[PDB]
Ligand binder design. Sequence first.
Ligand SMILES: [Zn+2]
Length: 46
Amino acid sequence: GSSGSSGSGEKPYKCSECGKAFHRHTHLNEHRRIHTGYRPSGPSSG
Ligand SMILES: [Zn+2]
C-alpha cells in the first residue's frame, strides 16, 4: 500500500483548483481571483 499521512494538522481552507493552502480564508479568496480568469477586456466594449 501507500505510506505517509505523518503529522496530523492541515489548514482548514484549501484551494481545489491548483493545490494551494492557507490559514486565513481571506488570503485563499484573494488567490482564487487568479483562478477566476481575471481579464481586463470583457464580452463587450464600452
Ligand atoms: Zn489555486
